[PDB]
Every structure is written in C-alpha cells, then in structure tokens.
Amino acid sequence: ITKVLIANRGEIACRVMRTAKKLGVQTVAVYSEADRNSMHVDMADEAYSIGPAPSQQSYLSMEKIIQVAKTSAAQAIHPGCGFLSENMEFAELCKQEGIIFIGPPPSAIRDMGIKSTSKSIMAAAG
Amino acid sequence: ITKVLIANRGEIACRVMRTAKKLGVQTVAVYSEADRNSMHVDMADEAYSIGPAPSQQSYLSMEKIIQVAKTSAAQAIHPGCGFLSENMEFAELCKQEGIIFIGPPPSAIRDMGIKSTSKSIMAAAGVPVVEGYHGEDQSDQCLKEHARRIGYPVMIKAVRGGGGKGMRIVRSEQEFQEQLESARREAKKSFNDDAMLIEKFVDTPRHVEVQVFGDHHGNAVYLFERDCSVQRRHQKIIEEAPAPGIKSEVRKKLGEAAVRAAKAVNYVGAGTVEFIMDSKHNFCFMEMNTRLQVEHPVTEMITGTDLVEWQLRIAAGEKIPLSQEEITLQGHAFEARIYAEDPSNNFMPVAGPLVHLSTPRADPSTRIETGVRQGDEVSVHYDPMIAKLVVWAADRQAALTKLRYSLRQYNIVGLHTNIDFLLNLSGHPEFEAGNVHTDFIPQHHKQLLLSRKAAAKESLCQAALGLILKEKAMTDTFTLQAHDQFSPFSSSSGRRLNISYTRNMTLKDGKNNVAIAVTYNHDGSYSMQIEDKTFQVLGNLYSEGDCTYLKCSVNGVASKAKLIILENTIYLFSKEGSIEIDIPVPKYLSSVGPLAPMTGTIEKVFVKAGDKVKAGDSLMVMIAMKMEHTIKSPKDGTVKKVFYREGAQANRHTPLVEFE
DSSP states (O other), X not given: XXXXXXOOOHHHHHHHHHHHHHHTOEEEEEOTTTTTXXXXXXXXXXXXXXXXXXXXXXXXXXXXXXXXXXXXXXXEEEOOSSSSTTOHHHHHHHHXXXXXXXXXXXXXXXXXXXXXXXXXXXXXXX | OOEEEEOOOHHHHHHHHHHHHHHTOEEEEEOTTTTTTSHHHHHSSEEEXXXXXXXXXXXXXXXXXXXXXXXXXXXXXXXXXXSSTTOXXXXXXXXXXXXXXXXXXXHHHHTTSSHHHHHHHHHTTTOOBOOOOOSSOOOHHHXXXXXXXXXXXXXXXXXXXXXXXXXXXXXXXXXXHHHHHHIIIIIHHHSOOSOEEEESOOSSOEXXXXXXXXXXXXXXXXEEEEEOOOEETTEEOEEETTOTTOXXXXXXXXXXXXXXXXXXXXXXXXXXXXXEEOTTOXXXXXXXXXXXXXXXXXXXXXXXXXXXXXXXXXXXXXXXXXOTTSOOOOSEEEEEEEEBEEGGGSOEEOOOBOXXXXXXXXXXXXXXXXXXXXXXBOOSSSOOEEEEEEEEESSHHHHHXXXXXXXXXXXXXXXXXXHHHHHHHHSOHHHHHTOOOTTHHHHSGGGTSOOOOOOOHHHHHHHHHHHHHHHHXXXXXXXXXXXXXXXXXXXXXOOOSSSOEEEEEEEEETTEEEEEEEEEOTTSOEEEEETTEEEEEEEEXXXXXXXXXXXXXXXXXXXXXXXXXXXXXXXXEETTEEEEEEOOOOGGGTOOOOBOSSSEEEEEEOOXXXXXXXXXXXXXXXXSSSOEEEXXXXXXXXXXXXXXXXTOEEOTTOBOEEEO
C-alpha cells in the first residue's frame, strides 16, 4: 500500500494519517461540504469533496468513496469507524473493483451480523 | 584523542565532526582557498587555509596537513576518504612525527597495494579468493585441462589488452572448436599475444561488501554486508544495507571469512572486504578497502552501531566495545546519492550555484547528510556530490517506499541533478522485485532516462495561481511600507464596477504556449478557462520555516505544492512529481543599420560584403573635426554592402553599411 484513502473525518482520520506519513504512505481523505476547513483536510496530501453536509450524502455513500479511490489511484481504503466500517457490501464492492479493503474479508463480516450465528460458530470452538 | 585534525572536506568532514562534538573531542579542519565558506569550516572549532583551489595543492599535500596538525596541537589525524586515506607514506610520516594516524598501520596498508600480494596472504588463511591462473601456460591443450579444473563455464581475456574484441566465452564443454576458430580469426590479430587468462562467470554478478573492524589487541568483529551492485560508469549510485537475497548461513560465512581475511593481513581499524557472488552463493574474494568508508551510515541504521566513535576509541588504544555476538540486524536501509550532473548527456558533472536547497523531513529513521548549504556553489575541483539520503524501515518494501517518498521532498533549484534518475531507478518493477545485478542500469538504461511530459491543465492552473498570489505578496509588502495603510486598492481582488475582470495570461509548457483566461470572482475564487475547460481555482500561500507553499483547491480537489519562482521559471514540487512552467519574456525586455555621428572623413574600414560580425563589433572608424569615432554594431547578421570606402567624406545621419 503506497497510497491509502481514508473514508472518515476528524480524530480517526488524523490518527491514521500520522502513521501513514511516518511510514511513507500517501494519504487521501474526503471532506464533504461540511469539513472543508477541518483538521484532516490539511493533514492529507489530497482530498476530494463529495456533497451535502449530512453523512448520508458524503461518508455513508458507497459509490462516492470508490470514485475518489479510483481517480486518486488509491491502492487501499481504510473505513475507520462509524461509517462504512461494518458495511459488508462495501468490502465486497472494493474486492470486485480491485481495491484493497483494510479490514476483515466480507466472509468474516457477513457471518457476524446475526448474533446467533456468531454465538454458535464460537461456541463450537470452545 | 582530545583533538583530531580532519584532512578532508564536505560531507565526510561534517559526519566525523558531529561525532567528535558528541564525544567531546575538538575538531580542526583545512579548507584551501576553495572552501573558505563551506560547511565544515563553520562546524569546526578551528581551521587553517593551505593554498590554491586544486586538491593537489591542498588536500593531497603531505607536509601541509602535518604542519596544521603541529600548530593546532592535534593528537590525531583522520584522513577520511579520497585524499590521503590510502597514502601509506603519510601514515608512516605521522608515526615518525608523533601524530596518531586514525586508520590501519603502514604495515597493513603497504601490503595491500599489490593485488597479488593480498590474494596470496588471504588465500593462505582459508579465504575463498578468485583463483584461476595468472600464468602464460594456458595454450589450447592446457586450456582444456584448466577449464575442467575450475568448471566448464569460462571467460577468456588477454594478459595484456582489451577493447571488447578477441574475447572467448565457454558455456559448455563441447565448444573448443569454436575457441580454436576465434583464436585464429581475430583474437591474435589485436592482442598479438598467445597468453590469455581465464575466470569463471560474467552472468549477472553482484558485489557484496562485508565490514571488518579490528583493534590493536587482536580482536575483530564483522558487521553485516551490503549489496553494492547498482552502478553506472563504475560509480555507486544507490546502496542497500542488509544485502538482500541471501540466507542467514551466507551472512555467517561471510562474517567469518572476512575476519580471517582481515587477520591474515593484520588489519586494524574499520575496513571492508569485497566479495563477488554468482546466483548460487559462490562467494569469492576480490579486494579489500583499508579506510573508513563513506558507505558506512547505510549499515549503521541496521546494526545500531557508531563506527566513527569506534574508530576513535581503538586509535586511543582501547578495545572493540561490542563483540560479534552482540551485533543485531533489524530492518533494511537504503542510500541514494545525489550528484550535480546532467543525465541527459550520459551524466556529465555540472558546476553552478544552488539557489534553493530543501531537505526531507527529519526523522530518526531518515538520516540526512549534506555538504552543501543554500547559497553555496558546486566546484569543478572536487567531487560533484551534493547530498546523501539514508532511510531505514522495518523491511525492504517499506524502505523502498520511504526512500522514494522522502527523495521527492528533496528540492534543488539552480542546476540540473540526478534526482529524477534516482526516482526512476528505485521505482522500477524489476528493482522492487529484486532483480539486482551489476548490469541493471545498462540493461534497462532506456527505461530510466525518460522524456519530458506535458503538464496537465490542473498543473497550469496551479502555476497561474502561484504567480497571481506572488504578485499579491509584492503588493502586500509594498502596503506594509506605505503611509496609507488599511486602504482599498491594496487588496488584489480585481473588483471592477458592475462587471467582471478577466486576465489573459500565457504560460509556456515546454515548447508550447497555453493561454489561460482567469476571471476574478467576487468571493475571491478564480475561474480559469484553459482552452475550453473551466476550473474553479482557489488557494493561498503559507510559510513553514523558510519555505513557501501554495495551497490549492481546483474543482473541489485539494492539493499542496511548494512554490518557487526563479526569474522566469515556476517550480511546483509535489508528492507526484515536479513541474517546471516557464513565463514568456516579452520582446522589449530581450531585444538588448548604424549611422554616422558627425560629418567627417573615414580613416579605416573594417569589413566587406560576405563577412559576419557579432554585436559590439568595429565596423568603421571616422574622424570628424579631430575626434576619432569608432562605429559599432547594435544589429547583427551579415553585411550586404559597405557604402563608403576609406578616405571618403560621410555626412550627418548618413547610412554607412547595410544588412540585407
């Protein structure tokens, strides 16, 4: 991973980018209309806008984040926490598009959605 | 050693002095007339001049360096690299004078001058040298026996001579009929000698260098070997510290073999034993270096040692502070050497001023060693190197990413360098995979020197914005000196009454001109139309230390690049490359036939038709009431007619010569 897109904002976006800079990895972020002058916009090497301030139009969007990853030539996407971090369809979309999803594979995410499914899988393991 | 004289300049002089200051040792340096304002003069506690700029009169002199050591009361001399570092007579002179030579004793230097002498001394100790034969007894029948003894692959070269002709290659046993044909067809017409020597392989060799450090008490340790295979014109360009591509057993074997070699020649100090390998780890000794080398900081990153401190301690009579079982191996380190040179003509060195110098961010894992400050010039009398960038990371791939990431932050403006070559050399699919051998660069040479590419329209928007904001800066610093402060007109807003203002500027991208129409918007944004496409361009300037950065937002895409504007050229340094956009120069700033000054007679004509003069040339001399007037040429070209021959009377404002 030479360039990572961080599909998140604020404290978590800055925490990851500081590590990336330390390692030598380029960072791209997104900022909606709402975070145009937030902390992670200036810390990033490049960032793209998406749309209206509510999260439904900016950070929870599946297509907009991929579109940013493709045009910036990002090799991996880090969802951080709270937006797409538990979105199994997004992890599957990244795989099909060819982008590294930083997180568990879709097969490990989907089976954890139902509490009774993970209870039985783990109980059978001791 | 309480005071050391360093008989060297530049990067190596500063590297040693920083350690000395850390230890508490006073440093003296020498600077010739050439380095009066170089980096190591100010870092030193005291420094002396010697003489004329060429090295023969300053750093290679034996007596001048001793004279400096005596008057400064230095206790030891460190030769560094390249001048007296291999001068055995100087080491003997120091001993006789009473000054500590920091390096091996003369007895260890002299026996290493002759390659056959060190080969025998080390071979007798169990060192795997390149064997072969150096005898003339290798005729056709003997050659068959010699090839069987060393193995069927053979490269045959003359005892005397070369040039790339007359050589014979054996890649199998049943090729001696071809060897006999070639020996008669061409080989003996150019060499004019029957005697030729044999070696084993020439197929993708690698140079692997393992360090040896010994002391005056009989101890020796080894530090982990480097891969030094990547070179062009027999000059090392980059270097890999942990020598990737080998196993831990190879590292142990090279450690023991190099210590046996260093003891065989009774070597003391920090030296290096150079091995050559094939693809199957058959290492053979070729040569040994007897000085503390400039390559060492790339290894220190992965061993965790300080070899300059170690060398000073054993020179004072101490033991090796850290044993061979305490030397670790963590991560990978790379060096990239930045030279003042122009690769477009197959690297000829260039010399000139450095107008801007910026280094990558400091970090314990990013070691920056420079010998040139901003405002300093590159000379022609000494090595054209500017800087060495050394990085460390947890593994090989992380270090290659960090090396390229930080290298693109290194900005030189004022002369041509090899930075773009280093970036294409590291960022090459085969180099990252690990396909490294001594012919890598000539094998892929055409893929490393790439032509200039056209700028994107977004990059032209950034250049136009930087220029506009620089003009604003000039306006702002004029206002700060004005009495009429806070007033309007000072804001470079382009606010016309009831209408908008569009500025039409032209930028030159390489060879081609591009017109950019910049509309000033009421909210401070710009709308820049380049050819047909409109960009919404916002941004400003900010400072970090002594560097100016341009902050851009173009169509919602934020970016940041360093903005340097030097005379006509706009430099944009970003994390994706470096783009140079030129500002065109108008005719009336770049323009800088003739008439008679009074009514006089002409003494001497100079030129006729068919001649050519260049500007500021004597065309005519005329005397007018006893005042000799020499006409000159503001114009240029070739004369078509001279209207007045010598001795004729010319009048006021009468045309003298003509250009067709």
